[PDB]
From a paper:
Actin is one of the most conserved and abundant eukaryotic cytoskeletal proteins and plays a key role in cell motility, division, polarity, and muscle contraction. Actin organizes into two helical strands, which undergo continuous polymerization and depolymerization. In addition, a subset of β-actin undergoes a process termed arginylation in which an arginine residue is added to the N terminus. N-terminal acetylation of actin, mediated by the NAA80 enzyme, plays important roles in actin polymerization and depolymerization kinetics and affects cellular structures such as filopodia and lamellipodia. β-actin arginylation, which is achieved by the arginyl-tRNA-protein transferase Ate1 following the removal of the N-terminal acetylated aspartic acid residue, has been proposed to regulate lamellipodia formation, cell size, and cell spreading, but the exact biochemical and structural mechanisms are unknown.
To assess the effect of N-terminal arginylation on the actin filament, we solved the structure of fully arginylated actin filaments by cryo-EM. Following this, using the helical reconstruction approach, we obtained a 3D map of the ADP-bound human R-β-actin to a resolution of 3.6 Å for the subunit. Local resolutions range from 2.2 Å for the core region to 3.6 Å for the flexible, solvent-exposed areas, including the DNase I–binding loop (D-loop) and N terminus. The refined map shows a helical twist of 166.8° and a rise of 28.1 Å, consistent with values reported previously. At the present resolution, we were able to reliably trace the backbone and resolve the density of the side chains of the larger residues and Mg2+- ADP. Compared with the core of the subunit, we observe a weaker backbone density for residues Met46 and Gly47 in the D-loop. The 2 N-terminal residues are not resolved in the electron density, indicating the N terminus is flexible. The structure of the arginylated human F-actin is consistent with previously published F-actin structures, including the recently published human β-actin structure. A comparison of the N-terminal residues shows the three negatively charged Asp residues in β-actin, and these negative charges are reduced by the removal of an aspartate and introduction of a positively charged arginine in R-actin. Despite the reduction in negative charge at the N terminus compared with acetylated actin, it appears the N-terminal arginylation does not help to stabilize the N terminus, at least in the ADP-bound structure.
Numbering used by the authors: 1 to 374
Write the structure that this text describes.
């Protein structure tokens, strides 16, 4: 192309969003999975591919051992992370990472190794002209187009809360909760053994992930929901497995997401999503707090339960004083927020100087990022 518009990769733990820089929607939304087949291949018909990264794994999941390369925001296996990125440019976008500049997001307080290796790989593997690393929550604020607010983003394995006032991070106040979507999925598996459905296989876990999205919804009052669910069959809901069996679910649909509000359930002693937002406000200075309580942005995937926005409001309200009324942004496209906001930052002028360049890296090595990025 005459104009090369830098790639925005929002590499998360659960998915791998990507696209060109010119739009408010990615082109490339495929779950970050490498499938390895787990039997002898008897037929000599075709030489089947040894590995099945990307959406193909979701179709062939029956005979595969699906694995996740990124757990808790952190890249446990790179060989698998390289395979996902090769698929991202060559197959998903059909573009060259050398004839295009590129920006990769990352959750805060990740071990310094993560940033370092990302920098090496973007320069040594795909030989990128220029690269950058950004924090998720700062970009989610860009998307909502507000200079000041507190951003609470929960994805699949990391939940983080970052408070910004008049375009100034207070980084002493940035809290992070491990509890996230994967912990919610894995708790539904554990409470569907109640009604006697077992999901031991990797692929079985992915079927559970799809029930949670279809039926799980947060409740204003947990106790009142529980009483009604026990009293009557109104709540009960029924889903068709891939075999053609039916599973019926009742109270389990509003207990999958309740763990967020009381991690006592999952076994952790973390306070809540509501107490984490509150406490990040209350580490900030007195004057800044009034503007923050007013603006509270929900971002990401596990912010997409119905009920969630109405539960947060009520929750923080009780914690806060009678004045300083709290309003929660909870936008419609919050699922792709982080990426859309990454679209803008690259689009925005004066971000050019900030871009790390091969030239700089060649002198100071991968450790360049530890001084040129936040
Ligand atoms: N409609 C939905 N309702 C509830 N949770 C959802 C929904 N869609 C996806 N999820 C959750 O969102 C996570 C993926 O969202 P996202 O934040 O975009 O990904 P990542 O953490 O990889 O960036 C999954 O773990 C899943 O639990
Ligand atoms: Mg995310």
């Amino acid at each position: 192309r005459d104009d090369i518009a830098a790639l925005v990769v929002d590499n998360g733990s659960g998915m791998c969003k990507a696209g060109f820089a010119g739009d408010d929607a990615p082109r490339a939304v495929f779950p970050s999975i490498v499938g390895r087949p787990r039997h002898q291949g008897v037929m000599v018909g075709m030489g089947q591919k040894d590995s099945y990264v990307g959406d193909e794994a979701q179709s062939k999941r029956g005979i595969l051992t699906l694995k996740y390369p990124i757990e808790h925001g952190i890249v446990t296996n790179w060989d698998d992370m390289e395979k996902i990125w090769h698929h991202t440019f060559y197959n998903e976008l059909r573009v060259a990472p050398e004839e295009h500049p590129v920006l990769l997001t990352e959750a805060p307080l990740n071990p310094k190794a993560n940033r370092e290796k990302m920098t090496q790989i973007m320069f040594e593997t795909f030989n990128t002209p220029a690269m950058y690393v950004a924090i998720q929550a700062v970009l989610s604020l860009y998307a909502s187009g507000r200079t000041t607010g507190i951003v609470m983003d929960s994805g699949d394995g990391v939940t983080h809360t970052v408070p910004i006032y008049e375009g100034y991070a207070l980084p002493h106040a940035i809290l992070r909760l491990d509890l996230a979507g994967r912990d919610l999925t894995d708790y539904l598996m554990k409470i569907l053994t109640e009604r006697g459905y077992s999901f031991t296989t990797t692929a079985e876990r992915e079927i559970v992930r799809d029930i949670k999205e279809k039926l799980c919804y947060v409740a204003l009052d947990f106790e009142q929901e529980m009483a009604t669910a026990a009293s009557s069959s109104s709540l009960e809901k029924s889903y068709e497995l891939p075999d053609g069996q039916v599973i019926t679910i009742g109270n389990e649909r509003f207990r999958c997401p309740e763990a967020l509000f009381q991690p006592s359930f999952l076994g952790m002693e973390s306070c809540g999503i509501h107490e984490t937002t509150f406490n990040s406000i209350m580490k900030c200075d007195v004057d800044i707090r009034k503007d923050l309580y007013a603006n509270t942005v929900l971002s990401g995937g596990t912010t997409m339960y119905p009920g969630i926005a109405d539960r947060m409001q009520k929750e923080i309200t009780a914690l806060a004083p009678s004045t300083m009324k709290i309003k929660i942004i909870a936008p419609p496209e919050r699922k792709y927020s982080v990426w859309i906001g990454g679209s803008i930052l690259a689009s925005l002028s004066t971000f050019q100087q900030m871009w790390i360049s091969k030239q700089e890296y060649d002198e100071s090595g991968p450790s360049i990022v530890h001084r040129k990025c936040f």
